[PDB]
């Protein structure tokens, strides 16, 4: 019970997971593959952690925090992913270790379709030139916004609104302090808001290079964390 004007967007920043770090050599397809579930699975756990302090997340209901989760997961590691790599065209920093080139996508097949998509996601944050504090606000936004929006018994879906409308006023805000006018500040939420499906696009191709294996994705698999020890 908060959410205020930038106690949000400083909380949202102290919430921020941590660097996440994978073994490794080198290097192949399951090379790129063995890796990139070692890491997208450690930083699942802290994924869980983030939501958990996002300023009222845990008073909605247990089902639906899980409910969300389960659908950002894939977006919201690839904004953090897009954000690291902001500042270096062609690369994707997927982590302090794992660093890859363009190129070195098609050494494994379908995976070099998603780079491009990722690069030009990423170019156009880079282009539009985004702001630590509007990336802080544009990844709680997926992450409140991602779901499968009632069969009744609400007043989840209420703190939810309650909650995606505190972030969404947030950025509005934050876009304010820029000092830009009004026509300007309106497009910068408009252009912003627009790549969120862009994100979305691109969380949904990948997800199916994911099942792509032989499975068929994170449920009660990290649910009792919700549960009880809260780590
Ligand atoms: O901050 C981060 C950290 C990590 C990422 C990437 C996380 N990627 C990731 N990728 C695969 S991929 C087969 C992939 C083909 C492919 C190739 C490229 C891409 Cl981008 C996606 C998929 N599988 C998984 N998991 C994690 C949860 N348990 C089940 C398996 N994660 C993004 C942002």
Same mark, same amino acid.
């Given at each position: 019970?908060?959410?205020?004007?930038?106690?949000?967007?400083?909380?949202?920043?102290?919430? *921020?997971?941590?660097?996440?770090?994978?073994?490794?050599?080198?290097?192949?397809?399951?090379?790129?593959?063995?890796?990139?579930?070692?890491?997208? %699975?450690? *930083?699942?756990?802290?994924?869980?952690?983030?939501?958990?302090?996002?300023?009222?997340?845990?008073?909605?209901?247990?089902? @639906?925090?899980?409910?969300?989760?389960?659908?950002?997961?894939?977006?919201?590691?690839?904004?953090?992913?897009?954000?690291?790599?902001?500042?270096?065209?062609?690369?994707?920093?997927?982590?302090?270790?794992?660093?890859? %080139?363009? %190129?070195?996508?098609?050494?494994?097949?379908?995976?070099?379709?998603?780079?491009?998509?990722?690069?030009?996601?990423?170019?156009?944050?880079? *282009?539009?030139?985004?702001?630590?504090?509007? !990336?802080?606000?544009?990844?709680?936004?997926?992450?409140? +916004?991602?779901?499968? !929006?009632?069969?009744? @018994?609400? @007043?989840?879906?209420?703190?939810?609104?309650?909650?995606?409308?505190?972030?969404? @006023?947030?950025?509005?805000?934050?876009?304010?302090?820029?000092?830009?006018?009004?026509?300007?500040?309106?497009?910068?939420?408009? +252009?912003?808001?627009?790549?969120?499906?862009?994100?979305?696009?691109?969380?949904?191709?990948?997800?199916?290079?994911?099942?792509?294996?032989?499975?068929?994705?994170? !449920? %009660?698999?990290?649910?009792?964390?919700? +549960?009880?020890?809260?780590?």
């Amino acid at each position: 019970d908060a959410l205020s004007p930038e106690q949000l967007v400083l909380t949202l920043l102290e919430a *921020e997971p941590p660097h996440v770090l994978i073994s490794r050599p080198s290097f192949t397809e399951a090379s790129m593959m063995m890796s990139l579930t070692k890491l997208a %699975d450690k *930083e699942l756990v802290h994924m869980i952690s983030w939501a958990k302090k996002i300023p009222g997340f845990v008073e909605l209901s247990l089902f @639906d925090q899980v409910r969300l989760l389960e659908s950002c997961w894939m977006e919201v590691l690839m904004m953090g992913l897009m954000w690291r790599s902001i500042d270096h065209p062609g690369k994707l920093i997927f982590a302090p270790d794992l660093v890859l %080139d363009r %190129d070195e996508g098609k050494c494994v097949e379908g995976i070099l379709e998603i780079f491009d998509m990722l690069l030009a996601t990423t170019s156009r944050f880079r *282009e539009l030139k985004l702001q630590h504090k509007e !990336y802080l606000c544009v990844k709680a936004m997926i992450l409140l +916004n991602s779901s499968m !929006y009632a069969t009744q @018994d609400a @007043d989840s879906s209420r703190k939810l609104a309650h909650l995606l409308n505190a972030v969404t @006023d947030a950025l509005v805000w934050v876009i304010a302090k820029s000092g830009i006018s009004s026509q300007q500040q309106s497009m910068r939420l408009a +252009n912003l808001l627009m790549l969120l499906s862009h994100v979305r696009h691109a969380s949904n191709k990948g997800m199916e290079h994911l099942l792509n294996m032989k499975c068929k994705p994170v !449920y %009660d698999l990290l649910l009792e964390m919700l +549960n009880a020890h809260v780590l």
